[PDB]
Design a protein around this ligand. Structure first.
Ligand SMILES: NC(=O)c1ccc[n+]([C@@H]2O[C@H](COP(=O)([O-])OP(=O)(O)OC[C@H]3O[C@@H](n4cnc5c(N)ncnc54)[C@H](O)[C@@H]3O)[C@@H](O)[C@H]2O)c1
Ligand SMILES: NC(=O)c1ccc[n+]([C@@H]2O[C@H](COP(=O)([O-])OP(=O)(O)OC[C@H]3O[C@@H](n4cnc5c(N)ncnc54)[C@H](O)[C@@H]3O)[C@@H](O)[C@H]2O)c1
Ligand code: NA
Ligand code: NA
Ligand code: NA
Ligand code: NA
Ligand code: NA
Ligand code: NA
Ligand code: NA
Ligand code: NA
Ligand SMILES: [Zn+2]
Ligand SMILES: [Zn+2]
Ligand SMILES: [Zn+2]
Ligand SMILES: [Zn+2]
Lengths: 377, 377
């Protein structure tokens, strides 16, 4: 396989437009695979990338959520082959390092997250066709591009009868929330759960809590449209903070839990002040908070009195989901329809219309946006 | 028993002197006991009280650490009787509430910490003899006084052959650190531990970690005098941050742990910036931090990137030690000499010389100060 010429969405400067460019995609080197994208999606992490956060690397092809088919492989691709359906991964799972051997973490020492925007050898496989200028990728694999190249340890081969839109959603937020309910804290039968923020992450928490038999599942969101979505996934109670401007969120949760708070609180907004509220909403002595959302600031402040309260604060990436061990189990639940993801899909666009996605995500009835591709002939 | 006239150390205003006053101590009411103090001690929490933190309640008799003998009892004193040796408690253990039934917490719903400086009925048992002016107590029992009155649920009857100085030290810091090594995080055989701050709290952590079979126990302190004390209690490695002003504490710990950090880090200084360092010094994915020390500020800041690191942050009061279930076991280890506390005792004063304690605590060779009392005739 030679160099492929295709289209990709490129951002050239912080807060600049995302524009369609003709690019070249080099063939995969050793331990790489080249993927034809089947569909993609978008979350807040992609928006941050267009503003140069965390690292301003430009020009850049955004996108980390999606699914594709292997078009070609380098040497030593660990059994991957053309025609396999794969989803890109945030981090790998070597199964042999000190962290993998514990069974207690998904934070593999050997395949950790990357922030370089480049392949393992410090070069890019993607370049502007007109100039040859090198383009940074996003995370371990750009998905807003007709073709991408990834390290074989950062893709997961998946069952080919999973729907591609649903696999795209399981490559990030819903899986993060769903997995957190047994990998980061053990939601048990009869326990109480509160979920701050009812986007795809919070909907994953809600469904995970429901499948674990939580008997009270409180969703909190300022967007009233989210209440019906939460109910579909198992939410038992809804709080809109804007209905009570003189009450704190933790006060409102305690009102539903006999003044005690919940066993497990999941922070799925990223709003910095809501970390403190999540802690105050969980039970003294036996409550756990998992802060999934990110606020993008330098540090986050915790009321110093919470340090005496016996609560457990469990830090977390990708919901504690191990990407080779646990992620296939979640996909299988989707295949077997134990989880139903159709209600996540609210909007569809094609890649040429990528700029419209940044307006669509502001709409109150948006949950997940699907990005579709055209075929070359 | 009538009203007792005795001496007590009183602070009249924030940052004022601590002065000996003649006071009156009323007899115990229902569910109270009156105690003759045998000895007392001092920690930073008492210093804060003289500066009006957390609540400026004056006039006040400071002191929460000590041991005494019951002089008289109210009705319904739950089996306590004159002549019992008791230590005052920060919080009780009812054994029947939702939190007590879990076995997972010492934060009893029925006997929580008090901040009122007053008895359960909103009055004081202590007053200035010359005026009758009411005096606030400290915590659940003032100890810088020849006689005190406490709610019977906030004292623990102890074995009368325990040494009174050692029991005084076990009423607070050493017990907090020691208990944290199995109640808040489970230090296991062969694990690594780092301890920031080697006062009585950190020395308790070190000894608890040693008894649990931790194979590396790193003590961190800017006071070089503490290194020898740490070694007596089981410390294997010592770091003085001042020896490397261009390296962070977490960097120095990682240098001793193959770049990984420790399984369990205990923050025993209260220095706000050291909470972040404790987290960075613990292992990604599988490390736990217990922040025991208090900084007395409104909030504490955590580097936002730590929220992705898989670490566990376990909040805590009194080291997770349940005051009726776990505290007697710790006392018994002291009786059976499995823990040796003689090295804690560095300075002794009598109550009349209480003002000198605030200078003694600044001395680099101070660990614990014992406060002694005279008898009335
Ligand atoms: N862990 C991941 O994979 C991932 C991916 C993208 C973004 N994030 C961070 O995690 C959060 C959740 O991700 P998402 O895809 O589900 O985002 P989302 O935007 O779809 O959901 C966020 C929800 O929080 C609600 N919300 C915002 N502010 C609120 C407030 N002050 N009080 C109550 N509700 C509020 C919004 O209405 C929205 O429904 C994001 O807000 C962002 O901070 C995490
Ligand atoms: N949990 C409790 O029961 C309790 C009681 C009193 C005070 N406190 C808080 O907990 C801390 C520990 O209590 P303690 O009785 O053992 O206090 P302590 O003062 O006897 O010990 C604190 C030790 O930390 C060291 N230290 C201070 N700043 C440091 C720095 N920047 N880097 C490295 N070492 C530093 C000091 O040298 C000292 O050896 C106190 O500092 C205070 O914040 C807790
Ligand atoms: Na590679
Ligand atoms: Na396609
Ligand atoms: Na998002
Ligand atoms: Na996040
Ligand atoms: Na009482
Ligand atoms: Na005495
Ligand atoms: Na102290
Ligand atoms: Na403390
Ligand atoms: Zn995402
Ligand atoms: Zn690994
Ligand atoms: Zn103390
Ligand atoms: Zn109780």
């Amino acid at each position: 396989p030679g160099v492929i010429t295709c289209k990709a969405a490129v951002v050239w400067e912080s807060s600049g437009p995302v524009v369609l460019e003709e690019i070249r995609v080099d063939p995969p080197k050793a331990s790489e695979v080249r993927i034809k994208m089947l569909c993609a999606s978008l979350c807040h992490t992609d928006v941050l990338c267009t503003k140069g956060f965390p690292i301003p690397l430009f020009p850049r092809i955004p996108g980390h959520e999606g699914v594709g088919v292997i078009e070609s492989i380098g040497k030593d691709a660990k059994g991957l082959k053309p025609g396999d359906i794969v989803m890109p991964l945030y981090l790998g799972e070597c199964g042999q390092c000190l962290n993998c051997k514990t069974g207690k973490t998904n934070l593999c020492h050997v395949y950790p997250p990357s922030f370089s925007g480049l392949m393992n050898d410090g070069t890019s496989r993607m370049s502007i066709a007109r100039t040859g200028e090198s383009i940074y990728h996003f995370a371990s694999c750009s998905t807003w591009t007709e073709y991408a190249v990834a390290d074989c340890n950062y893709v997961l081969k998946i069952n080919p009868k999973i729907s591609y839109p649903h696999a795209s959603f399981l490559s990030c937020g819903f899986t993060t929330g769903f997995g957190a309910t047994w990998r980061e804290t053990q939601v048990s039968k009869g326990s109480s759960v509160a979920v701050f923020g009812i986007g795809t992450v919070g909907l994953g928490v809600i469904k995970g809590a429901q499948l674990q038999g939580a008997s009270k599942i409180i969703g909190v969101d300022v967007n009233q449209y989210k209440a019906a979505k939460g109910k579909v996934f198992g939410m038992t109670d809804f709080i809109n903070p804007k209905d009570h401007p003189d009450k704190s969120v933790s006060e409102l949760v305690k009102e539903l839990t006999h003044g005690l708070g919940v066993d497990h609180c999941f922070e799925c907004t990223g709003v910095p002040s809501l970390l403190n509220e999540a802690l105050e909403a969980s039970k003294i002595g036996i409550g756990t908070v998992v802060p999934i959302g990110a606020g993008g600031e330098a540090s986050v402040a915790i009321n110093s009195l919470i340090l005496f309260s016996g609560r457990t604060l469990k830090f977390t990436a990708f919901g504690g989901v191990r990407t080779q061990s646990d992620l296939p189990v979640i996909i299988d639940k989707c295949l077997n329809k134990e989880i139903q993801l159709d209600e996540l899909l609210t909007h569809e666009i094609h890649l040429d219309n990528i700029q419209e996605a940044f307006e669509i995500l502001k709409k109150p009835d948006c949950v997940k946006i699907l990005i579709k591709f055209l075929e070359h002939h």
